[model samples]
Target: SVTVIGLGPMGKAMAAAFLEHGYKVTVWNRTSNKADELITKGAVRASTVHEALAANELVILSLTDYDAMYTILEPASENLSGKVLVNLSSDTPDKAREAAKWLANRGAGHITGGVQVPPSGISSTYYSGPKEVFEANKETLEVLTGTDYRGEDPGLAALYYQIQMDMFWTAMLSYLHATAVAQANGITAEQFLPYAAETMSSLPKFIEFYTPRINAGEYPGDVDRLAMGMASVEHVVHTTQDAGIDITLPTAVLEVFRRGMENGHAGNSFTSLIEIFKKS
Candidate 1:
């Protein structure tokens, strides 16, 4: 039995998952209508936030951020004592750390959770908190996703999630930029889908191929040289310019590649660009 606060798609699905597993679930959302379906499926609705916390020791929060958590639960402070909050919202590690500290003061245990997949998929989730707390609720939490317990430090979960997000957005924009340039040249996204998918599929291999070189701080142009990489990106920038599409994305890459070139890495691996990132 547990209480779930917030009723966004994620929270709703979590409540559904718990109900599917035959748990007595209590749900609360500022937007009462969000819980309508869950209510029809036997979820008890708590009209007030504190009542939700009072209903169960394990309360799951799926709001927008740490800010939303404080906004919704500050009024229910009294009810938070002795409860364990599994917060699955995305935010900075410092924010997660702060929430853990805040919850501790209120006698509530904080377990930071980073949902790896969307509400529909419910894939493996990264979790970080006190080991005993994680061990205590491992099975119950797995109803939402396979548990990936990171460490006692609560920030680790958010850290892992944030790093993935870092990789995702830039990669996503790269595709958008390339596709825009293609569309400018009269190519449709559908026309480019195969090539796009194939290009994306090859990225993992590329990373692996250069990972060791990066780790060893060696950049041998034998595989992919900075000079060649710079020229390739420069061509993209030129293509974008000629196509009248935005040059922001390719320009960004060209800038970085230019820096690596300036650093005399023309004959070395573009992986040597790692130096700029590590530079002060």
Candidate 2:
């Protein structure tokens, strides 16, 4: 009932998930042989993109990005009419807008998804595009992954994807930078493991506490003040510099805190830095 084009690890996993759920899966990859494993598992291998498109009304694409889609799909453009392509490729909102328009002109439906890991071993994909089209394919899509419908604009899903990635990588870098300082001082990751978890796990509580206030543009130093925070951040930079580990991350954090103080937010909450961040 579905065809999967582009047999990268994600696409292959998706194709396998479909077969495991008892749906007929047709697979196509530009390099061709990548589908062999799926073929062995009873997925029909389409020799060409046209054949893949003709095989099913619903197709899932997991390409490198939007451009690869054009390279493969344009040659088979004739087969595109009336098809529903759930593009689970990674790209920006700008590209998603153009793709949504391009697919619409081809008389096809475009549903974009941001696939992070299958959360909890259950694939979770955030989707956006034609509302009714998503509704129609919801059941089938959920077989391979749980679908989170993110409204009608194709760009919305990608926008959400970017911000989530933006936050995650920055947070990850923070952890890595701290871990590096620990290692530089002869502390092993195993010894620092629980401590790191404590810091990371504490984030949700802080996020939960500040989210409403941030949204309301409020900065209260009721519990913690920026002046104290700047001193604490300065100590981290000094400690990292003294440890001879790279001081870049902590130094950047210190600069932000310094800016917060210079802006006369010394009595405000550390969250007041959001305003300083906004200016530049």
Report the lDDT tens digits of candidate 1 across residue range 43-158.
88877887888888899999877888888789988878999999997998999999999898999988999999888975799999898988999999988999999999899999
Whole-model lDDT, candidate 2? 0.85
List, in order, the clash count of every candidate structure. 1, 0
Q: By lDDT, who's the top model here?
A: 1
What's the lDDT for all of these models? 0.87, 0.85
1-280 per-residue lDDT for model 2 (tens digits): 8888877768777777778866677887877665476666668886688888988899988887899888888887877999999988679998988988988889898899888674234357789998999999989888777789999999988888888899988889998988999999899989999999999999899999999999999999998999999989988988888988888777888888988898999999999999999983
The C-alpha local distance difference test score for the whole of candidate 1 amounts to 0.87
TM-score of each candidate structure, all chains considered together: 0.95, 0.94
